Amino acid sequence: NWFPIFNPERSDKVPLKIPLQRNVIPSVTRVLQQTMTKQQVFLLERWKQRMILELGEDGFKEYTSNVFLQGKRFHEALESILSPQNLLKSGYIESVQHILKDVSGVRALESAVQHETLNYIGLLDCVAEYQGKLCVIDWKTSEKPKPFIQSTFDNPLQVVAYMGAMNHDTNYSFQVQCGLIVVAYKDGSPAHPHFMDAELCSQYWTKWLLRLEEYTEKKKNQN
Template sequence: MTPPTVPNLLPAIAAKTVCTQGYRFFVDEQERRLPSVTSILNATKPIEARKALARWRSRLGTEEATRVATTASRRGTLTHHQIKTYLLGQEKTCPDAAQPYWKSLRPVLQDLDDVRLVENFVFHYDLGYAGRVDCLASYQGQSCLCDWKTADRPKGSLERLYDAPIQLAAYCGAVNHCYGDHGIQVQSALLVVALPDTEAEVFWLDADMMKQYWRQWHDRLQQFYSD
């Protein structure tokens, strides 16, 4: 598959990851440390979501639940790395474990152009959080923030992706905060779920939807800092 044109990348923000007391923080070159979006969402997860996760672990058993989670994390990491090398115009043989998901994603990736960010750190210093975005590009001619997921079976709806849309809204806010001086004001997002042996699910989040999820993110952020 032919990679997109050589990306016109925005300047990357150098940062490192630090984990302490169960939270992940990103630290920039000035040693400013901010909690990750994922850690904030985990810390403010609604009680019903926590109960559902506990029921799942109980149903599978601790050992099997850990195995499933580890396998999912590994395939996600491998798939993300394959996407990254492709978007940056590099050639790399896809690992066997990621091959079904890579095949699922390829039609979506072929509709991307004007790639500006690929797995970059972003910070929102005013609101106090940070994250690492998968991709900022244009999809079918519309500028958007992209997020890649892998799953064993279709999700069917955004609701079954739980906090993923809120996570994307948080990332959009941080991207606009970091790169506003470069003319970046992204308002839409693309959430793609790669599936084995079938085409990926594609969820488009328009500006109105993103505003809704941004309000939810703002509430979770306030809860995190007030607890």
């Protein structure tokens, strides 16, 4: 019951600088967000200026908050739909009805992955079968249509980062060789599923590894 502040088994009579693991092992989000191309940074900055001019500085902050909240709500609704036992009325949930009918055999939900040797961590949405094929599934709300996998920006990199980590994480006894990005729409129009077979996942894996090396090179130029 008792927790001592001192440790009488020790004595009390270059300095140690022990790294904090959570600070030196990045999340997938952090790696991707800190290594965007100058062109993507430009497009996002030009869009943000247009939004601030249209909405005002506080209006844009509120827009940004609402985009995040809508996404979090969608994922909360999905977590309860995908688990064994007002949130479920949204247009996004309507958007993915035809996808959900092909999803089965859920094996992980909002579950931590850590790559033992590439030193990154993440939290995946979902591992489940889509039309019988076991997938890391990345569910995404989106304001604009994303009818091609190339319309999804870094989403395929997030998918393969989770696959590679999960496949080399001793907390998991199975491997996953396919990915799926599901883009859902607020007006209820049919969601776009972008399936990634093993070949396509291996192609994006190369690109993810480059982003991870860019992040690593960026952090040692900061030290």
